[PDB]
Design a protein around this nucleic acid. Structure first.
Ligand code: MG
Ligand code: MG
Ligand code: MG
Ligand code: MG
Ligand code: MG
Ligand code: MG
Ligand code: MG
Ligand code: MG
Ligand code: MG
Ligand code: MG
Ligand code: MG
Ligand code: MG
Ligand code: MG
Ligand code: MG
Ligand code: MG
Ligand code: MG
Ligand code: MG
Ligand code: MG
Ligand code: ZN
Lengths: 137, 190, 115, 176, 76, 47
RNA sequence: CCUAAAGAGUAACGGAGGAGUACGAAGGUGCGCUCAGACCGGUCGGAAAUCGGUCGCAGAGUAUAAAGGCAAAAGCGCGC
RNA sequence: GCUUGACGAUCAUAGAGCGUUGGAACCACCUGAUCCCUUCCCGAACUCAGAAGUGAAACGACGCAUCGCCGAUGGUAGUGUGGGGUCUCCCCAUGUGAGAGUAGGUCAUCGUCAAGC
């Protein structure tokens, strides 16, 4: 799917997901966007599932941008294994999402077609979304 | 048309500004520029949101009415809630007859359907940008800068230097030796 | 130019040592036509005594040689005494301690002030 | 030799030939450095003592031998052992070296229509090579080893290469 | 796991802050390298330890080119 | 100029077979004869 | 070095790496000097050898990991 | 007060870049390498003896905001204490309050000494 070509370190701490998205919250490339209104986490197979559904619906023209990149590795512990014995191995890559972040953008289509193409995408994502339009400020 | 009502603000801070947006439905603001000191004001959220539905809100002169004294300003910046999208703060720039000022002016693309690159080669018009930043005198600030794409073929790129501007208007970015793409014609996605 | 710029870089270590020790200094300047000597108090701020070839009894015409540097050296030592100073440190200001600079220093030693 | 020659007509003529308002900024040549980078002696180290002796004859100043500044395994060398030698010429030696190379040996090289004007950098210095070490009249033909590629480099006080070329219009430079 | 190693802590940092009264020989800073430089009345150890050579008060001033941080002793 | 390390330098005697003579200094200490010189070369005059 | 919560300290079969040496000069001192890289020009080398010039200023270097330092260079060379 | 040199205070609001200008003195370039001294070669640099030429190069002075560097007011983020919620995150009362950006500034300001007015 999507993941870094190479990274400095294999593993990472869990951390916390706090705050609003004051950066990456504007429509910068296209004319309409899908924007997160709740916080959460996107697992790079939901991003691919939602990209096919969006692109398969337009099927005639239109440019699409993906503004999210999953760069945080998460580990899992195999089943029937006790606590301890070192950290688990990396299983999938994921992205942190704060309220207000733009996920996908599109242009070159009508407002009515984009609005129903973004509805198909939002049905694959585990977080609340909204439809927004580009503004001067 | 372009008129806004404001009241002087005197209780400043984070706690006071949060009470404005819950209890009273107001919006904190500030007016600076000219040769005068800045001034904190308040204005209704419903009034500012209604004026901003207009297209040329940021490229037109606005008559501000603080108390009873009127003054000429221009929307310079605007803070929005990242999630809900409503306006939380606004700052205005005082307008003086002889003083160059910087504004953001939207672009208008016309005759897209009759473009050479579209009807002949089946290309698609892509808008790389949608507004440009200009500097000029207040008396000749344009509401929108015109760009046409009739004589554009497949693969041709439109730059800042190509488009013409009203007399007395400077493109700023072109002045700093950096012309940026505006639009192009490219081959179809599928 | 590079010629002067590299000399000031060459003279910084000795000057910074004297500020640390807070000792009186005897600074020398040498040009193609004259030579200079100054006694600077403890921190580069004030000049106590001075002597050069521009005094109105040495402006005779030949000031860019060795013996001209000898007369100023034995003249700056006299002026240092009037200021009640001895026990200074010689600062060559990046010039090599070989020629006109050396002849200047020997006159000061004979003049009475001791390094 | 060529000292007085430069200041009798070459310097006075170039003053008003480019229409100068002052006299020092007329181009003059400061130094000539020979250099000859011995690609061989990678491991043998048997031509340095031979390259030192021959290069002495052309000039008469004891040469200095240069060392590798890096490793670069592609040439199977590394820093520490020398790869080439060089000499620097100034004032009288480099003038008298010029005329001897100008025409005592340069006409009798082999085949040459002249010295091209394309061997100029962007500032006004000239560089040109020499394909055989025996070309000069200071050495023999039999007691000398095989071909060695001696070089010539010129350095002038020219702002740009055109008046550097103009200065080299004098000195009887075979420029085509 | 092949990671379980670490070294003992070295207890570095500032030992006397600005305004404090000092005596000759007092250690002022424990360092790696010179985050702070020796000013007036301050010496430097072979492991870059700043120590007092006079009696007075710590100063902690930034001055000169290079934007260096200096520690010096002044009159109380 | 460093001494004892620079070998003998002199004015020699140069004489081209065409009668051309230029007194230039070199390091041979003997007269030399030239078959060709600047006054008799095809490239210097357009041959 | 991170965890370690802007003084110190701080655990886990937590996340990452090194050591069990070297040097009689690789120590002391006086004197002197600045790198990597790029471009142009130049015999066999040609993107990369040595040479000339301009820019560059530390993107080099530091016996040995990483961190903190380095123009009075703590980097480089020579005499004693 | 005016100009030039030496040494400092202060380390970009003081820097870079562009243009103009300075030889009366000073400074710089300059001539030569006998003599002290020097180059792992070269009087290039260090040094010695002055002085015929020039302000070209360098340096200084004066202009310009183009780049750099400074930079508010207001708002926002975070946060100590007390209290709430729908409690992986927030809200209220009270105290505190950035970074970024915006309007806009900047072609420095001083001290001692010596030579000429
Ligand atoms: Mg955890
Ligand atoms: Mg606030
Ligand atoms: Mg609060
Ligand atoms: Mg030193
Ligand atoms: Mg530790
Ligand atoms: Mg010690
Ligand atoms: Mg701590
Ligand atoms: Mg802590
Ligand atoms: Mg600890
Ligand atoms: Mg414990
Ligand atoms: Mg060492
Ligand atoms: Mg390091
Ligand atoms: Mg040594
Ligand atoms: Mg603020
Ligand atoms: Mg609390
Ligand atoms: Mg604040
Ligand atoms: Mg700020
Ligand atoms: Mg800033
Ligand atoms: Zn002949």
């Amino acid at each position: 799917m999507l993941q870094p070509k190479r990274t400095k370190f294999r593993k990472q701490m869990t951390g916390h997901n706090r705050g609003l998205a004051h950066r990456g919250s504007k429509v910068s490339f296209g004319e309409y966007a899908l924007k997160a209104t709740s916080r959460g986490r996107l697992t790079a197979r939901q991003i691919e599932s939602a990209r096919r559904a969006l692109t398969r619906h337009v099927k005639r023209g239109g440019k699409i941008w993906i503004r999210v990149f999953p760069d945080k590795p998460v580990t899992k512990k195999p089943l029937e294994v006790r606590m301890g014995k070192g950290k688990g191995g990396v299983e999938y890559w994921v992205a942190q999402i704060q309220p207000g972040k733009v996920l996908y953008e599109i242009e070159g289509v009508s407002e009515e077609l984009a609005r129903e193409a973004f509805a198909l995408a939002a049905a694959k994502l585990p977080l609340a979304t909204s439809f927004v339009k580009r503004t001067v400020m | 048309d372009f008129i806004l009502n404001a009241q002087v603000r005197s209780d400043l801070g984070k706690g006071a500004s949060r009470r404005l947006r819950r209890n009273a439905g107001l919006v904190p603001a500030v007016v600076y520029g000219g040769d005068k000191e800045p001034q904190s004001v308040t204005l209704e959220l419903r009034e500012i949101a209604k004026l901003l539905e207009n297209e040329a809100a940021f490229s037109h002169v606005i008559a501000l009415n603080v108390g009873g004294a009127k003054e000429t300003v221009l929307i310079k910046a605007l803070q929005r809630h990242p999630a809900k999208g409503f306006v939380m703060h606004a700052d205005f720039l005082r307008v003086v007859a002889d003083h160059k000022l910087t504004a953001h002016v939207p672009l208008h693309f016309i005759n897209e359907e009759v473009a050479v690159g579209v009807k002949q080669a089946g290309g698609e018009i892509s808008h790389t940008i949608s507004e440009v930043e200009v500097s000029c005198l207040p008396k000749d600030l344009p509401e929108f800068i015109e760009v046409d794409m009739a004589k554009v073929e497949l693969g041709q790129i439109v730059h800042l230097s190509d488009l013409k501007a009203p007399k007395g208007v400077e493109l700023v970015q072109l002045a700093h030796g950096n012309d940026l793409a505006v639009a192009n014609i490219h081959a179809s996605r599928v | 130019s590079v010629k002067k710029e590299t000399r000031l870089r060459r003279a910084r270590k000795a000057r910074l040592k004297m500020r640390e020790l807070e000792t009186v200094r005897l600074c020398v300047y040498r040009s193609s036509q004259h030579i200079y000597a100054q006694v600077i108090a403890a921190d580069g701020g004030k000049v106590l005594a001075s002597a050069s070839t521009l005094d109105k009894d040495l402006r005779e015409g030949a000031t860019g040689n060795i013996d001209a540097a000898k007369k100023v050296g034995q003249l700056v030592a006299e002026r240092a005494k009037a200021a009640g100073v001895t026990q200074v440190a010689f600062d060559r200001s990046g010039f090599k301690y070989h020629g006109r600079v050396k002849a200047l220093a020997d006159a000061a030693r004979e003049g009475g002030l001791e390094f | 030799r060529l000292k007085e020659i430069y200041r009798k007509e070459i310097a006075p003529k170039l003053k008003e030939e480019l229409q100068l308002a002052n006299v020092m900024e007329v181009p003059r040549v400061t130094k000539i450095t020979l250099n000859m980078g011995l690609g061989e002696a990678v491991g043998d180290k048997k031509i340095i003592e031979n390259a030192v002796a021959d290069l002495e004859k052309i000039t008469g100043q004891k040469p200095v031998v240069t060392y590798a500044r890096k490793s670069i395994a592609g040439f199977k060398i590394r820093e520490g052992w020398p790869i080439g030698v060089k000499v620097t010429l100034r004032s009288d030696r480099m003038y008298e070296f010029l005329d001897r190379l100008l025409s005592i040996s340069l006409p009798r090289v082999r085949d040459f229509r002249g010295l091209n004007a394309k061997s100029f950098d962007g500032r006004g210095n000239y560089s040109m090579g020499v394909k055989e070490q025996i070309i000069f009249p200071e050495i023999d033909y039999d007691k000398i080893d095989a071909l060695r590629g001696l070089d010539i480099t010129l350095t002038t006080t020219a702002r740009t290469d055109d008046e550097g070329r103009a200065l080299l219009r004098a000195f009887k430079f075979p420029f085509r | 796991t092949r990671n379980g190693r670490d070294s003992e802590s070295k207890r570095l940092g500032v030992k006397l802050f600005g305004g404090q009264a000092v005596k000759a020989g007092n250690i002022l800073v424990r360092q790696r390298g010179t985050k702070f430089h020796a000013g007036y009345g301050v010496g430097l150890g072979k492991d870059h330890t700043l120590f007092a050579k006079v009696d007075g008060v710590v100063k902690f001033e930034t001055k000169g080119a290079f934007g260096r941080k200096y520690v010096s002793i002044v009159a109380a | 100029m460093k001494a004892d390390i620079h070998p003998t330098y002199e004015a020699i005697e140069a004489t081209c077979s065409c009668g051309n003579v230029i007194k230039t200094r070199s390091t041979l200490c003997k007269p030399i004869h030239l078959d060709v010189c600047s006054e008799c070369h095809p490239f210097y005059t357009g041959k």
